[model samples]
Target: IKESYAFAVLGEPRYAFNFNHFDYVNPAAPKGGQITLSALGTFDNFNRYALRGNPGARTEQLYDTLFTTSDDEPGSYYPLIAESARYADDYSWVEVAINPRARFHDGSPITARDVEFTFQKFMTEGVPQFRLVYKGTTVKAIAPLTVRIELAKPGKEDMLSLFSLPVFPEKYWKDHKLSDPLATPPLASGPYRVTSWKMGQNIVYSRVKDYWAANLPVNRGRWNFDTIRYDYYLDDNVAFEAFKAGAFDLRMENDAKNWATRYTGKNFDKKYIIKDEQKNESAQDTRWLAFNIQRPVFSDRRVREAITLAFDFEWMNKALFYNAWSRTNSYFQNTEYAARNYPDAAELVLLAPMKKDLPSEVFTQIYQPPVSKGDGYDRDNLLKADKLLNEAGWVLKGQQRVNATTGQPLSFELLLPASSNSQWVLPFQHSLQRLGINMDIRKVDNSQITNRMRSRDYDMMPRVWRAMPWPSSDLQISWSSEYINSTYNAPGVQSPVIDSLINQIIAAQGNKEKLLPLGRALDRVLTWNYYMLPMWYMAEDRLAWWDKFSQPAVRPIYSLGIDTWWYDVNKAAKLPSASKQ
Candidate 1:
């Protein structure tokens, strides 16, 4: 089981098997068996720079590179595709030396050419999400195996910078469009190879019989399954049913009531399956309503604060979610990186660029309070909400709060997925009823949710803002002035201080001086206006598995789950319950 800093895994990680259920890790996993899996969701493109932080369906399977990740660890760059890397003193330039032996799924050696091509493609065609990072970066090749990244500007967090990208094979798509390859099997230099694809239906991948780096410092004794498959289904309930009938390898029960009430003793019987209640440490993604500060109505701090007071989060959590979640108060809720004390006058001066458009009185009234601390929910949050609404010239008429300034009733639709239409959003609708706020909860098809978000048509929606291993300039796009023009912000948000701080954040070399103040500053500005009504963060309380996956005590701490998971086909095959129904 154990070797020199490596473990002797029984099954090969490359064989074709279901990634959804434990069959790939079955004790008697057939080496060449073809595993059909359902692949769900849509990706705008395969551009890494724009969609760096967001994990789509493809990331979990059919990719590997400079690093691997675990759901339990913070994302850190490891020697996956690259042998080593170095950064200049001022963070002006960083170079990564590719592993000469690294090869794509087709056995073509990965070279500096591939690295150069991937970065350029995203910089050109990626959505604004990709543009926020690598705004003006330059890549130069010093050797066939060495690529030097010269930033037009110094980066704040340098070591883990390229972890944001998973370099693809340059030879495969050098002349092709990044968006055009969706219908075909994607060529990858990762641990596994894409053997079959069924468009929106299913995708199947088998292990490369002889993956080049199966025995390296990073990948030694890793990638244990002979096959890994991703199965996609349109309906989660249907998906769950499939799991119960041997469709998926591991299934996460998202509904708390289902976890508490439905899945219990008999359901988890060993004859049926084995279940583990897993908890990991990480940021609880903050789900909130992002405001369009670009709109004049939202220009007033009270208007923003008023909106925050409309819904009772505590009651919403208790009644609807069966008391499963916690309340979020700041951008960084679980960590000390959250803003503790109010920023002093001197600090405010540095934030002038973000607040340039905001009135001085407005700034004094909202941001300068001794009450600017971010901890848990402010008890007087609702009372303050009412006072703010009244100041915004809104009067409560029946159950609806009408805006006095525009003579328009303050009402908006809160959109979410239909799966939660009856469960998640209904309770919030009930809570808003008490505040005289007419917030409509609409649950459209999940695909429709994507279309709506792309068009910026919704007035209000419960949205989740994810936390990053090293938080960066991307957060600006969420609430920044520039992004308000077309892409993410439809209504708009303008802040000069925020812009300056964003630049400052991007300028630091690593987590040392770059992360803390910038994180606090971002939280200060994000919470000050109440753009997002903070929800609870579970901090890795959530559970996830891909059938027969197991990890030994000795391993990398930064694995993001996909790349570093060890496949134990034999142990996994016992759980047919993980397969699709």
Candidate 2:
């Protein structure tokens, strides 16, 4: 096997062995302050692998991966727990050497056996997605400090994900059950360990005083806070009030209305709090209202198409989001893979075979979602929606739209958590009212929402399709027929054509020239079908925090690393008692 210090998909690593630290880190940043953050839902489980309970916020901080990824570059790996890795030329098999200095919280050395055990445990007891990824792979320890993983097929994407798996200690977990929720934190081997917990109320993690890999190149200036605590609240308004009253140190605002109207106080004018918007070019999660295709109301293409026309995105952008969001045009939005213009020759080759099964618009027209005039009521689109719904046999009887044969009124429940902001949904609700359709917006607790989604018991739910910068096998799980019943298949997509395109994209791995055309083809197909009501996405992140914390001058390209931020002593000391919560 050929050994290397770094790994990359398309080419060599960006940083050499001589590099000291990641470009986004501040090596000299001081770290001795506590950071208190907020979480909305209650967490019962400390075990992140279990599917039953909610994983505690930042529970991932408890373990380290075989190799850590750099924030500035996609598909690049840097040494962390493992010193280096050796792989076959085809990348079908890989051998990783554990860092000799790696030690768990209990002071037990992390060995090759731990890596082997973790893989086996995940395959047997973890979530279903884990089993799907490692179905044809084998893991075993070849030496005391070395573990080898062999794939049945030569897949570069699968190999990379394997190397990034969280390595667990075999000794500590041998006596514990892997499937149950726990109040006690598991034995950890990362920069921090769970120091305390109060079940559903809060959890605290303290930085390891003598972390074994503290000085590694990947660890130079990250995880700076001495203590990290997460406080839970059932209501968002209460959470925002708490943050304003100094109950938390930082918050990443998701509600544009709150960010624009609510973030005002004496602390803001006095600079005791800092509000900043960071521009980012990374893949934005394409949020949308997903319909369960298994439901009869949504099974018809005409009905689905009519439903999307009622969403007045233009009015929502102007009135609700402060013009902060752009309409999502494609499944792979903000990337070169997004379909544009007409189907190119390369895309046509893939589309030609499935022409009979797809919409006629996929060939002649550039796929664009229905757009509305900036006015609160889009009369034109609603008229077109009415025409389409009428053609689908849902005619207006008195005030309700009912099926011609069954006489069943067109209605469906939109399942949402009690804490969800319903301001944007109100506009669409009004539009649906004009169509004589009853959209019952059912608000339930977070736990109930989770349970219903797991059992496919809801008609519609708001979800986001978050794709990686590089597409992989996970795409199949999202849009394939084989995983239609899986929890990740939120839309209940069971299209054979979509499954074929996903396979084509996966087959084009390590070859971008071929991958681009396949991705564009797949994107065009998914968008033309209108399985979802395309929503809006922000071009930048809106974040706010107290003035006491400081971070590195250079931000990571892929993420806003709040974990790397440190509390500034001088700034904290100068804050008034009222400003400091």
Candidate 3:
């Protein structure tokens, strides 16, 4: 079971043990120049593990994992801090031999003892989410640069997730508490180190000129920028303006309105700025109006279903989004894991046992989000929503829908940050009004929203779930009852059947025959439960950048691999004088 330079869920790794570098990377790419990026909100803490303050953006760049992944491959791991790793056939135990040349920012050699210490620190002082999976796992240093990790209850995800743990320096962190928010960056082990920072304004990371593992296969053409600086703005609008003004080098546009209308200018016309819709093969994650099941109103599936029906995605797409998005129907939409086809024999086997526990329609029907006529007022959908609300024990009382039993008006607040405009929700609010429900749009500060979301204080909010291609391990954190109140379980899902399906998928261990049915079945159950009012997703990344940078011809299947891009001195020289910031 011992192996060198790789760990894979499949029987063997795609890359040979002596493979030079990731094929997606341009190994000969030049490395220099500064790239300034923008973040939306302020960050007060450098401690990424802290449960309290907002951790700075790109904090992960400061640390190295035992194994790093190639963006082109979904389940493969490449060596980073560890030169080689050995794991049992059953994946019950894993031992990693530290890379001899790996050194911390302070120039101290990375040791196996540091690995053991980091794991222990995560379990004890890190977030509750880590403790849920790693608390029972034991870590020890068996040799000077070799650490052994034994899992109490082994799962494919647990093993891989453990290996992805950020290796931290034991000496520097000995006096620091992981729970406290510290402004100073921790001693790092990656290609970039924090050079300087102005509180809540900007943070500059200077690339290590002699970074120990810069030439490693996994990193060969990546992290090419000599200096990476992140400047904070109040919101997306300001940030987009800054990007257009050449204050930043690159931007991955998320707003459809901005992409469709805002990127047009003399700079774009003169070729000093480039706008691109980079198509990606990876399935986009699900965004939805998440209902907190912990709340009494949403506890009833009927209410959840009714509220979902009131969302007029068709009208919104045309009016506000300029038809730039597609409706997300499944948790695993645009992937093989999605429940597009009705339950086959294989899926039925998993669903049959939970018939009494789930809705009757789950067996007979194909679950899809309700479609509405592309009008601002969707009468048919609203009527259906009204009937569903009535069935759920809410009846109209003087234009306001009140609970049939308690006479309390049906009302809930949708939480969003003050920086975000409430215009998008106006149509949904109007539709909900027609259904006799008070859908109040509550806009608060970003910090308050973060704190409230962490505490589960909101009834409804926009949330996103990034489902992996092989979702078994990650889905449990979102849908499992055990992590109902933890981070990423924002909807507060608590389903025994979902928990069972999660375990079933994990047991499959990436086998297609085992994974296909289980994955589809899990998607079906989640969709049927009406956990989220499904939103829309774009198929490609709408991006814009100053034409001064150049990227590899081959883009990674799963990511943009922006780190692999290098500044083109020639292009920078040719840029129009007016385009200079």
Candidate 4:
């Protein structure tokens, strides 16, 4: 089939043939059916799907973005909201020509006017929870269909930044507080529209049977189901058990211990469960310890590094964690976005950047040697740790490793969610004790974890970071200076080098060229800091499916859980991927 594409007129994105992508053929997708999913409703912040984007929201899931993404490409955003967006030469200004063909569920055209309104609401009265997003941002509608966004400074942030700001209906939401929970009326311009929403209970989005952009290449042969439903769960254990009994079609096993022992292997009924491996590097899911850099001790890089040495990751992974987790080397375990101009670099890059605001001796002093390959609980490893701490000022007086200089003990708190995995944290608590590092292991409920983290109230805690298809949001949250004082920076960490790299990534244009280098730099910086005590990246080696659900070929990494799931009732009936007969 020879395809012909049209030129995208300004303020009007190309419709029939804009991007060249593989055609997806899922003709069997049902025209309409409700999809019930188990979710925590943790995705409360609605604006800037990019700030803390989620998978559950019907408004952001089926509607926004320039293109609907394809599964194979990681961190790639196909045009959806704006047909295409780009930064002007200075990288300070971004222009997005809206798709005239796109329309909200109310049947109103989604134009530059809506984009302007979204920015206004997101900036003025959006989730104060993520104020870093609106810092130094100004949005303007160049034309009825074209939006021009001016940033405080321009370098590398336009690409994904725009995606974060969803295009809401200006007419309906302009006077309303977009971030307020009371404003549940969704005026989205995506393929699906919010048909109904029940606060703290269930929400449903009815497919726009007559959506204007339905047949576009980005949305073709997808989002065919008529209705999508999301049911909230108070407890994850209850949710998991419900998933077993077939309440929802898909179950995401975020808990590693359960994934390792409960779901798969020896005794489980292999016949009923069907697991599939979805391969990709862009999925950046992770868990680690975040420091409240606000504290005097943690503020010192050496102090932070010293504490990292106390953990026996290899031992815990094997014995305590049952070897189910992977170690995170830096803030970003496997990302090029992390800074890298290390000593091995080609002279010019390394010497120039290190001259200013860079302390070689302090960094070297805190630099942990590459982890030796073995069980982390080796006698020699523990001995080396004792020696390092002793030299660093903490001389073990009795059972506690006390600060020799100030007489203060090397004590810290370990916060954990009271989950099935809380037991794993206990082993680390004991491991640190052997090294004379006093650990007051505390187990709190899920709400406490969020409260403590939101307020930067912790010495250290077991934290998890969910990966997104794109690096912009992830990098910003973990290391962006803008967030050092805000939400994601739970432990209040800060670094000049990391700050610069984050700025570079945000303002970089021509994503592929910029992200590769920026990502590499980020990797080096994070590895050196070791802010996160690294863990293994979980490959989608598990299986999930409803009795009749299957993913389409072009599955983009958008919504977190159920929003992206599509069930072809006719085909689902024919091909049950379930392990049981």
TM-scores of the models, in the given order?
A: 0.78, 0.97, 0.97, 0.79
Clash counts for the predictions, in order: 60, 0, 0, 47
Off by over 4 Å in 2: 577-581
Residue 388 error, candidate 2, Å: 1.5
Which 10 consecutive positions of candidate 3 have the poorest summed lDDT? 572-581
How big is the positional error of residue 204 in model 1, measured in Å on the Cα after superposition?
2.3
Cα deviation at 9, candidate 4, in Å, is 21
lDDT of 4 by residue, 118-230 (tens): 77776767655345665777778889887877777653334345654566777877555554543354456666666676655566777778878766655655676677667
lDDT of 1 by residue, 1-581 (tens): 11111111111232122222221122222333333334335333333333222223554445565544333334333456776666665556767777788888777787888877777776776565555666777776788888888777665243245544667677766656654434445677666666664444555556777888766544544455567677767676676656555665566555666666655443366555555554545555666665555445466777766666655555656656677766666666566566666655544655565565544532453332223123223447656777777777877877577776566876667766654424645555654555567776677765577667656657666566666544555556665667763355534556665676676665542544456667766667666756555555554444434446555543332233333445555765675543344
How big is the positional error of residue 115 in model 4, measured in Å on the Cα after superposition?
1.9
What is the descending lDDT order?
Answer: 2, 3, 4, 1
Tell me the whole-model lDDT of each prediction, alpha carbons only: 0.56, 0.84, 0.83, 0.58
* RMSD, one per candidate, in order: 7.8, 1.6, 1.6, 5.7
Per-residue lDDT of candidate 2, residues 8-90 (tens digit):
87667898987899888899988798888999878787987666777788886679888888888767898888898888988
**The 10-residue segment with the lowest total lDDT in model 2:** 572-581
Name the better of 3 and 4 by lDDT. 3
TM-score of 4: 0.79
